[PDB]
Design a protein around this ligand. Structure first.
Ligand code: FMN
Length: 363
């Protein structure tokens, strides 16, 4: 097929194809310590023919943690383990970005430092569930704990934690960093009027709601380089953990314009929740494309045909596939050859071990 398999310059690195591996939480890290494993290194290595791998969401700090089994990038042991994973990808001539998150109110007190309430823009429960582990280490669901609103004087420490995690990612050998500003996590909790009822300079107006994410962007650009920074947004639609308010399109375009001023490597748009949503209109895609001067990655139930169509139209540059990458380590070769895909086994997307993780065969 015609443009999916051609190179693309993505900030400081060049992808040999446009078939990207979306960030995918798999909840297989070691506890205690939230440490990446050899098995996770093998999983990533198997996928290194991707144009770019974007890692599972990774904590910037202990406080960022909201899921048992999700890895961090804040401790020495975590840095050491990730260095190995990046070295494995590089040994197979791949490229890998770390997605960095703070889960905010999508968390539980039992996995917070001190066992205390998690933090958010406002003290409003997400009214959803997260994943913990039981006494045998198996993934279980638990209702989210009501959070504590961050005090104004705590906000600089959040920005610093993102900055430090990006410094640690560089040390760890990642090619790029993806800020997780999507899916109702901390940055999005500030962005959304649904989850942010603050009356300080971090709530109310769109400019106030985007203030935190833009401070984080600035801090990480300064720490490393703008051509090493990507951002994931999900600014249109209703996600499990939050909606985008009553002026979603205008607010999205405001944010995107701001992000472009920073000259960052990429804009990754998660277009719908797993549960579905209204498709992006081509008019809205044009409006995004004229505001952002870097690479645009599209995601959300894409097929190869839709990817080619929108790439051919000059509307996006690359596609991130999530579940097809879970099941097909050599998704690039399969798409290039129009080969059949392995069937997905959703029961093993979260937790467990090798089964449903490293046992999906290549051609
Ligand atoms: C098991 C699983 C875990 C995911 N984990 C994350 C994540 O860590 N970060 C994130 O931004 N999105 C995550 N997503 C969303 C995916 O990155 C992707 O946007 C989504 O699966 C839709 O694309 P698909 O139809 O190609 O699977 C996850 C999706 C699934 C199914």
């Amino acid at each position: 097929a015609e443009k999916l398999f051609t190179p693309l310059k993505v900030g400081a690195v060049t992808a040999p194809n446009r078939v990207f591996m979306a960030p995918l939480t798999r909840l297989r890290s070691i506890e205690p310590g939230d440490i990446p494993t050899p098995l996770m290194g093998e999983y990533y290595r198997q996928r290194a023919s991707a144009g770019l791998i974007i890692s599972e969401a990774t904590q910037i700090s202990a406080q960022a943690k909201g899921y048992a089994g999700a890895p961090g990038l804040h401790s020495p042991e975590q840095i050491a383990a990730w260095k190995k994973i990046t070295a494995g990808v590089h040994a197979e001539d791949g490229r890998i970005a770390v997605q960095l998150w703070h889960t905010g109110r999508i968390s539980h007190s039992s996995i917070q430092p001190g066992g205390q309430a998690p933090v958010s823009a406002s003290a409003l429960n997400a009214n959803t569930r997260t994943s913990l582990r039981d006494e045998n280490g198996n993934a279980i669901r638990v209702d989210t704990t009501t959070p504590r609103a961050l005090e104004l004087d705590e906000i600089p420490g959040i920005v610093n934690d993102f900055r430090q995690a990006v410094a640690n990612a560089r040390e760890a050998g990642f090619d790029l960093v993806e800020l997780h500003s999507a899916h109702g996590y901390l940055l999005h909790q500030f962005l959304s009027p649904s989850s942010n009822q603050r009356t300080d300079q971090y709530g109310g107006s769109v400019e106030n709601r985007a203030r935190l994410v833009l401070e984080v962007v600035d801090a990480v650009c300064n720490e490393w380089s703008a051509d090493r920074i990507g951002i994931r947004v999900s600014p249109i639609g209703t996600f499990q953990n939050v909606d985008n308010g009553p002026n979603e399109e205008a607010d999205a375009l405001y944010l995107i314009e701001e992000l472009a001023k920073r000259g960052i490597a990429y804009l990754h748009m998660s277009e719908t929740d797993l549960a579905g949503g209204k498709p992006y209109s081509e008019a809205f895609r044009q409006k995004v494309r004229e505001r952002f001067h870097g690479v645009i990655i599209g995601a959300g139930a894409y097929t190869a045909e839709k990817a080619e169509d929108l790439i051919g139209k000059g509307l996006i540059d690359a596609v991130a596939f999530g579940r097809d990458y879970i099941a097909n380590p050599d998704l690039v070769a399969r798409l290039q050859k129009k080969a059949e895909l392995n069937p997905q086994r959703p029961e093993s997307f979260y937790g467990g071990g090798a089964e449903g993780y490293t046992d999906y065969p290549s051609l």
